[PDB]
Amino acid sequence: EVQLVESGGGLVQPGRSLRLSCAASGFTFSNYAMYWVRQAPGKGLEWVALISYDISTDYYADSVKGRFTISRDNSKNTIYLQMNNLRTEDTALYYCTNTYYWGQGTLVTVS
Amino acid sequence: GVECDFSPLLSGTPPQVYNFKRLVFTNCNYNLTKLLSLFSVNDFTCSQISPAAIASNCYSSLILDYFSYPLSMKSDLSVSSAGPISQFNYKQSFSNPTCLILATVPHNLTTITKPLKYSYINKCSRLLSDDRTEVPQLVNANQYSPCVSIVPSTVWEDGDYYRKQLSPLEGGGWLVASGSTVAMTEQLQMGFGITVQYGTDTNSVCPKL
Amino acid sequence: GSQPVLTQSPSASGTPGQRVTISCSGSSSNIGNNYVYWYQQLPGTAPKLLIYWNDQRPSGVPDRFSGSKSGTSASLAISGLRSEDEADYYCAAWDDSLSGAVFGGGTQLTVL
Ligand SMILES: *[C@@H]1O[C@H](CO)[C@@H](O)[C@H](O)[C@H]1NC(C)=O
């Protein structure tokens, strides 16, 4: 079975730091691009970051350039999303995906 | 009332297996046995229904797929087949009664035009940025290969290899495919696919009488 | 949430059994050279892939969903519209200008 578990989410004061994780199982990890999508309560999905299956390149939304970092570890089938100088616009539910499977998100709140 | 229209079948070049043409019927009356008398049926094997029954039952939908196909590849066009045809070209439903017919276009059926040869997608993968690791793209049921976007509608040479660049959303890398061919035969041979669905108070695709 | 590069007219009406489509429009940097994906999200659940690589259907999605991509716009049609289809529907694609993925405004369909 395919499962995708996030963690790390929580509470932080504006401008603090928060590191997210996402562990995967049920497929060949070293075959898929993985990425983070966030949803502010009552609003639409917004694409956040993507990292390749080779700890290659990473891609960022202009909303998060220079603050967020996406990381990856193929020996643990895991992804990281480092968040720095967070802001009130970073309040959202943080989803981790390939494209086929999503995860039950994780909460990021800041105010 | 209205009659089910099978005409397109008899007029044009039927595509290759991986580009199958599909007619979808509702609220009509059909005479399948009339259709098949226009050809030389060489094989007619159904699954979860019979040749007798599929010609005489009431459906919510009848769906018919047709394509050029060499009779010499009979073993690869089978509801139990695991060859390239179900892997990369054409796959029917398992959860609905289906059928597979193998025919030959007779000489007095003059509005059916032959293609250069027969061709099938023998391999459809996706490789990663490493240009080595290959991830097969197996065709979904009732759908075309994602790699028909890069395969010519008829493959010129046995073994030809195709390629296209993928954006990072899809993992980067390339979408890759390869084709095999079979020499056109003196008479055009074809393959057909039939799929029926039964509904509750809505079975309006029934045989003509 | 700062406006997405895609325009998803968000109201979608129909009736049970009807066919409603969802139009997703953009520019030539995203739709047009990149594949479209369609997602379904129920009230308070994770999103689910409906259509990937603009027309492809993962095994498990009912046949009532299908996708298409013309030159600049993409759309998700639904036959036999049911009641479990009451959800939020989003399109997505890569953008060569931003070198990042782009989502649409998000349409909500209500039908009864
Ligand atoms: C077509 O149907 C009619 C009546 O339903 C029947 O007389 C006729 O034999 C059928 N044609 C063929 C070729 O089976």
Cα–Cα distance for residue pair B60/B199, rounded to 1 Å: 5
Where in chain B do CATH 2.20.210.30 domains reside? Answer: 117-183
Is B180 buried (19+), middle (13-18) or exposed (0-12) by CB count in 10 A? middle
Tokens (6 digits) for B24: 């979808």
CB contact under 8 A, A31 and B133: yes
Give the distance from residue C17's alpha carbon to the nearest chain A alpha carbon, in angstroms: 27
Please state the domain extents for chain C: 1-112
Cα–Cα distance for residue pair C16/C86, rounded to 1 Å: 11
Give the distance from residue A19's alpha carbon to the nearest chain C alpha carbon, in angstroms: 21
Cα–Cα distance for residue pair A80/C21, rounded to 1 Å: 37
Handedness of CA C31, C34, C39, C45 (dihedral sign): negative
Handedness of CA B179, C63, B198, B93 (dihedral sign): positive
Q: Strand order of the sheet with strand B161-165? A: B117-127, B174-183, B161-165
Burial B48-74 (b: 16+ CB within 10 A, else e): ebebeebbebebbbbbbbbbbbbbebb
**Residues near A53 by Cβ (< 8 Å), separated by ≥ 6?**
A29, A30, A31, A32, A33, A34, A72, A74, B128, B171
**Residues near B169 by Cβ (< 8 Å), separated by ≥ 6?**
A33, A50, A99, C34, C35, C37, C92, C93, C94, C101
Is A48 buried (19+), middle (13-18) or exposed (0-12) by CB count in 10 A? buried
Nearest ligand 1 atom to the CA of B209 is 5
Q: Which CATH superfamily is domain B1-116+184-209 in?
A: Spike protein, C-terminal core receptor binding subdomain (3.30.70.1840)
Question: What is the helix (H) or strand (E) element at residue B144, kind and residue range?
Answer: none
- The partner residue sitting opposite A100, judged by closest CB among C1, C4, C49, is C49
CB pairs under 8 A between A and C: 57
Cα–Cα distance for residue pair B170/A31, rounded to 1 Å: 10
Structure obtained using: X-ray
Of B178, B177, B180, B176, which is closest to residue B158 (Cα–Cα)? Answer: B180
Question: What is the helix (H) or strand (E) element at residue C4, kind and residue range?
Answer: none
* Contacts A90 to C, Cβ<8 Å: none
Please state the domain extents for chain A: 1-111
| C-beta of residue B90 within 8 angstroms of C-beta of residue B139 | yes
* Contacts B169 to A, Cβ<8 Å: 33, 50, 99
Place of tokens 């028909």: B148
Put simply, whether C94 touches B (Cβ < 8 Å) is: yes
CATH architecture of B117-183: Single Sheet (2.20)
Where in chain B do CATH 3.30.70.1840 domains reside? Answer: 1-116+184-209
Ligand 1: residue whose CA is nearest its atom 12: B34
Ligand 1: residue whose CA is nearest its atom 3: B209
**Residues near B95 by Cβ (< 8 Å), separated by ≥ 6?**
none
| C-beta of residue B126 within 8 angstroms of C-beta of residue B176 | yes
| C-beta of residue C3 within 8 angstroms of C-beta of residue A61 | no
* B4 Cα–ligand 1 center, Å: 14
Hey, which residues does B172 pair with through a beta bridge? none
Which among B30, B34, B35 is the best mutation to test ligand 1's pocket, defined by most ligand atoms within 8 Å of the CB? B34
Put simply, whether C99 touches B (Cβ < 8 Å) is: yes
- 3-class secondary structure, B9: helix
Cα–Cα distance for residue pair C92/C34, rounded to 1 Å: 10
